[PDB]
């Protein structure tokens, strides 16, 4: 009969005017070989008509082989849709990968199938052959001991070619390096002879790499209400906990019974909130250009006013030690520069736990563990692979680029941040011990931190709304293929993927609440909701606020160049400016915060992946329901943000990227 | 200086002025610094916006720095 | 400072030094000026070569200014000359490595088909005009990794 074959090409690099591809239309009863001439163009697919004499039957596979190609020629085959003879629908064969080498690439039929016990099945033999090929290409590596494992790639050139950046992402990344280096060099020239002695000297570099919210931050960073606002709706909304008791590190000296009465009053009211930075205790600080940086492990106690705004009660910059059993308690009634420096020390320490624990570990490293285990244990026919492959896009490269340029020894993190030079690795090990499965789930994390039902917690409202939308998207896809709990237990590729994340990828995270196996649909549904939220929604909340809150460097210092204050009266402007980072560290903070938090011009919004891995109309109906519910949330957040002087923009689904890409 | 205008002091240049009307040391050195500081900031703004696209009102933010005030931000 | 090295003065920073070993005002202010003058010229060279393509030897002319001397201008003209390359072992920045060869080095392993060079090396060795610069101290030294490269 007549077969209409449409070949979609995402990207191509052809030296010649045309390239030849040998194609096999493999059916249930036979196969037919084809020869197609690729002449791809952007915006449309190439259509091919072929006449066969033998009856292929139901098409199951489409095989590809590049016929006599040059070595520099590359082809990114998106998908192959074959319209069979008659009134039957077109059969889709999604490739979405670079066709590598001269060997035969077999594309299975795009209907997602769970593996069965029939070893003679053609799809079962393909998915076992594919997982052997994936586990040789995708391999685990130990970047640092005690940390979750990464992809086996020292550089980005060592990566698998399907995990590489495409042309528009890579050229934008190369542009941002030049745009960042231009602005840092001009700021170096502009502030070369300038004297760094007052808070207004940061205006000399507060341009270019900044945002509209950062201008509002510069006006109001000394306000106690904005300092408290960042624990709920700032760049790091993940540390603030509702205090069920007074902390044992909060040791009040004699003569401070007014604070003790106020702390107990908010504790019985339930409005006492804490942000404990005790993970930074004993972390060795950086040495930047021979200048010693300094770290602290602060505790800030905050009270929730009835108007819905947090207010700070007491800042204890250092935890008790045997040398100093009662550290200095800093209050809003103190001399201004001493209280400003104490807020700056909390905010500097908020930068440390944001960038290392909640940004690097909790989103980038977790998603890479999800990314590598999805490739290693879920073949292309698996529905959970087709579910997760848009959500693991560019994750391995950006973590490889971070491990090469940012968090490497002597990297950009070592040149600006106080935890660099080895202390961030030690902080990452402590953060990995605290990396629980409940902490990555906002219904479990915000209940553990007691942030449920807070009207001013705009992250917590949007994260719970996003979790319900994503779990509905998860339950729509999972129940299409896992109708019963025994099907979830009877899926050996899913149980291997669950073990590859928890036991292998997250380095034996069974003691931290991560499941070693899936015993029900809901346990699978909760874990997959955690995977999508970490890759998309948790990353967006933790990354997109970097230019808004860190472009003004005194709002959250990347480092501190003086020891934490112990006497309030000795703190002067030279103490504050000597503690705040110098201009070279402050320019590097603005450049990195801009580069990480800018909107990628090639970004895929959440749920808006154009790649059609699924072929059934029912998974497309769930994905369209996902885009419908996010658009409903997009209107709800925008209507809320119009009535707020300090809007929370980072969890708008239009601004939420579909994976961890930057 | 020009016809139809109020008359000026007879001095083509500042060196042709009466010596009692000249700038003192602090005024003259501050005036020379401001010419250098003005030329520094303009040349860096020239480099920063050399290849930038000037097509929207937010592109003036690329040069709205340095020589500005608190009221100008408002 | 490092094990196996000659010992230093006990000072982690310059502020830990004895006060009589410190820089005076004119030395310290000149040192601070050179850091600013060095950072100015590097930042402008970073800007000037930000979009430049680094594909030919004449691209080094884009940064060959400022921090240079009269002899370095002559060096730029004549660095590909074999006589200037050989001149630096005697009168260059490092005149300390070149030794007169009393014998052929054991690391100098000539393959087959290079008997003309073997005749030339033995000719200069018996004449006493054979000189060597052996950089064998660099053998097995782990190389740097600069910005991941
Ligand atoms: Fe990120």
What torsion do the CA atoms of A68, A70, A76, A81 make, to the nearest 10 degrees? -20
Question: On the CB side of A105, how many CA atoms lie within 13 Å of its CA?
Answer: 23
Distance CA A401, CA A186 (A): 25
3-state secondary structure A145-164: CCCCCEECCCCHHHCCHHHC
Is the separation of the CB atoms in A346 and A277 below 8 Å? Answer: yes
A348 is in an annotated binding site: no
The contacts of residue A9 (CB under 8 Å, 6+ apart) are A38, A40, A45, A46, A75, A76, A77, A78
SS3 for C53? Answer: coil
Taking contacts as CB-CB distances below 8 angstroms, the residues of chain A near C39 are 188, 192
Token reading at A29 = 């009863």
Is residue A86 left, alpha or beta, with left meaning phi > 0 and alpha meaning psi from -120 to 50?
left
Residue A480 contacts residue A622 (beta carbons within 8 Å): yes
Minimal Cα–Cα distance from B74 to chain A, Å?
10
A257-283 b/e (C-beta count within 10 Å ≥ 16 → b):
eebeebbeebbeeebbbbbbbebbbeb
Contact assignment for C13 to A408 by CB distance below 8 Å: no
- Residue A304: CB atoms within 10 Å: 22
Question: What distance in Å separates the CA atoms of residue A400 and residue A155, rounded to the nearest whole number?
Answer: 6
How far is residue A195's CA from residue A224's CA, in Å, rounded to a whole number? 28
- Nearest chain A Cα to B47, which residue? A186
SS3 at position A494: helix
Q: State the distance between the two ends of chain A, measured CA to CA, in whole angstroms.
A: 48
Ligand 1 center from residue C13 Cα (angstroms): 36
CA distance A306 to A283: 37
Nearest to A207 among B40, B47, B65 (CB): B65
Q: What is the chain B residue with the closest CA to A215? A: B73
In terms of Cα–Cα distance, which of C129, C1, A182 is closest to B44? A182
Q: Which helix (H) or strand (E) holds A444?
A: helix A442-448
For residue A186, give the nearest of B44, B61, B73 by CB distance.
Answer: B44
Handedness of CA A6, A12, A18, A22 (dihedral sign): negative
Q: Would you list which residues of chain C are within 8 Å, Cβ to Cβ, of chain A?
A: 13, 36, 39-40, 43-44, 46-47, 50-51, 145, 147-148
Q: Specify whether the CB–CB gap between A310 and A231 falls below 8 A.
A: yes
Residue A206 distance to chain B (closest CA, Å): 8
The tokens for C41 are 């010229």
CA distances from A539 to A260, A399, A534, A613, A642 (A): 38, 13, 6, 24, 24
From chain C, the residues in CB contact with A188 under 8 A are 39, 43
Alpha carbon distances (Å) from A249 to A110, A263, A423, A436: 57, 14, 22, 23
Q: Find out whether A359 is annotated in a ligand binding site.
A: yes
Residue A351 and residue A417 in contact, taking contact as beta carbons nearer than 8 Å: yes
What gap in Å lies between CA A161 and CA A13, rounded to an integer? 14
Smallest Cα–Cα separation from A77: which of A166, A7, A169, A160?
Answer: A7
Joined tokens for residue A358:
């909640």
DSSP A360: I
The answer to whether A427 and A352 are in contact (CB under 8 A) is: yes
Contacts of C129-137 with C-beta under 8 Å, sequence gap 24+, read: C130/C100, C130/C101, C131/C89, C131/C98, C131/C99, C131/C100, C131/C101, C132/C98, C132/C99, C132/C100, C132/C101, C132/C105, C133/C89, C133/C97, C133/C98, C133/C99, C134/C97, C134/C99, C134/C105, C134/C107, C135/C97, C136/C107
> For residues A372 and A377, what is the distance between their CA atoms, to the nearest angstrom?
9
DSSP A186-240: HHHHHTSS----SGGGGGGT-SSS--HHHHHHHHHTT-HHHHHHHHHHSS--SS-
In sequence order, the β-bridge partners of residue A302 are: A273, A312
SS3 content of chain B, % helix, strand, coil (to 5): 55, 0, 45
Q: Which of C11, C15, C63, C148 to mutate to test the interface with A (most CBs of A within 10 A)?
A: C148
The per-residue DSSP string of C63-82 comes to T-SSS--HHHHHHHHHTT-H
Residues paired with A291 in a beta bridge: A288
Mark yes or no for CB contact C47/A185 under 8 Å.
yes
DSSP percent split of chain A into helix, strand, coil, nearest 5: 45, 15, 40
Q: Which two tokens stand for residue A617?
A: 């109309």
Q: What are chain C's partners, defined as 3 or more CB pairs within 8 angstroms?
A: A
The single residue listed with the structure tokens 């320490």 is: A349
Q: Whole-angstrom Cα distance, residue A640 to residue A645?
A: 10
Q: How far is the CA of A532 from the centre of ligand 1 (A)?
A: 15
Handedness of CA A379, A381, A386, A387 (dihedral sign): negative
* Tokens read off for A623: 């994905």
**A543 has binding-site annotation:** yes
Q: Are A558 and A591 in contact (CB under 8 A)?
A: no
Q: Is A624 annotated as a binding residue?
A: no
């Amino acid at each position: 009969g007549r077969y209409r074959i449409r070949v979609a090409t995402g990207a191509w690099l052809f030296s010649g005017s045309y390239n030849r591809v040998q194609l096999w239309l493999v059916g249930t009863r036979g196969e037919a070989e084809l020869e197609l001439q690729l002449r791809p163009a952007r915006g449309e697919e190439e259509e091919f008509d072929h006449d066969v004499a033998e009856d292929l039957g139901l098409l199951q596979f489409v095989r590809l082989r590049k016929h006599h190609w040059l070595v520099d020629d590359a082809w990114f085959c998106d998908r192959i849709t074959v319209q069979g003879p008659g009134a039957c629908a077109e059969v889709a064969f999604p490739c979405y990968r670079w066709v590598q080498g001269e060997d035969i690439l077999s594309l299975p039929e795009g209907t997602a199938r769970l593996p069965g016990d029939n070893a003679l099945d053609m799809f079962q033999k393909h998915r076992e052959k594919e997982l052997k090929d994936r586990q040789q290409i995708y391999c685990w590596a130990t970047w640092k001991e005690g940390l979750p494992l990464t992809i086996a790639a020292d550089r980005k050139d060592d990566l698998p070619p399907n995990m590489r950046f495409h042309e528009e992402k890579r050229l934008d990344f190369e542009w941002t390096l030049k745009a960042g280096a231009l602005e840092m060099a001009l700021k170096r020239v502009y502030t070369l002879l300038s004297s760094w002695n007052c808070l207004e000297d940061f205006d000399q570099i507060f341009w270019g790499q900044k945002s509209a919210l950062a201008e509002k931050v510069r006006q109001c960073w000394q306000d106690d209400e904005l300092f408290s606002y960042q624990f709920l709706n700032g760049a790091n909304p993940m540390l603030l906990r509702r205090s069920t008791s007074l902390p044992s590190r909060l040791v009040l000296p004699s003569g401070m019974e007014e604070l003790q009465a106020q702390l107990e009053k908010e504790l019985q009211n339930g409005s006492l909130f804490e942000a404990d930075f005790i993970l930074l205790d004993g972390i060795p600080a950086n040495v930047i250009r021979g200048e010693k940086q300094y770290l602290a492990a602060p505790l800030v106690m905050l009270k929730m006013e009835p108007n819905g705004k947090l207010q700070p009660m007491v800042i204890q910059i250092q935890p008790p030690s045997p040398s100093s059993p009662t550290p200095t308690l800093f209050l809003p009634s103190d001399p201004p520069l001493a209280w400003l420096l104490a807020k700056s020390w909390v905010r500097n320490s908020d930068f440390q736990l944001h960038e290392i624990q909640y940004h690097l570990l909790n989103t980038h490293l977790v998603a890479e563990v999800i990314a590598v285990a999805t490739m290693r244990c879920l073949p292309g026919l698996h529905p959970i692979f087709k579910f997760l492959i848009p959500h693991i896009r560019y994750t391995m490269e950006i973590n490889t680029r971070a491990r090469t340029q940012l968090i490497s020894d002597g990297g950009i993190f070592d040149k600006a941040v106080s935890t660099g030079g080895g202390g961030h690795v030690q902080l990452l090990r402590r953060a990995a011990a605290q990396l629980t499965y409940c902490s990555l789930c906002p219904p479990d994390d915000l209940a553990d931190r007691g942030l449920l039902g807070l009207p001013g917690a705009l992250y917590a409202h949007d994260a719970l709304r996003l979790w319900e939308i994503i779990a509905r998207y998860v339950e729509g896809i999972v129940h299409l293929f896992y109708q019963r709990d025994d099907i979830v237990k009877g899926d050996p590729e899913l149980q291997a993927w669950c073990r590859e994340i928890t036991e292998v990828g997250l380095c034996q995270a069974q003691d931290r609440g991560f499941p070693v196996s899936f015993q029900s649909q809901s346990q699978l549904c909760h874990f997959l909701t955690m995977c999508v939220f970490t890759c998309t929604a948790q990353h967006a909340a933790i990354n997109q606020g970097q230019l808004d809150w860190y472009a003004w460097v005194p709002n959250a210092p990347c480092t501190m160049r003086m020891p934490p204050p112990t006497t309030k009266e000795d703190v002067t402007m030279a103490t504050v400016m000597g503690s705040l980072p110098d201009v070279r560290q402050a320019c590097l903070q603005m450049a990195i915060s801009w580069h990480l938090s800018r909107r990628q011009p090639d970004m895929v919004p959440l749920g808006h992946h154009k790649e059609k891995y699924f072929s059934g109309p029912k998974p497309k109906a769930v994905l369209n329901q996902f885009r419908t519910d996010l658009e409903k949330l997009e209107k709800e957040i925008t209507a809320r943000n119009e009535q707020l002087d300090w809007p929370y923009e980072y969890l708008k689904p239009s601004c939420i990227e579909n994976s961890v890409t930057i």
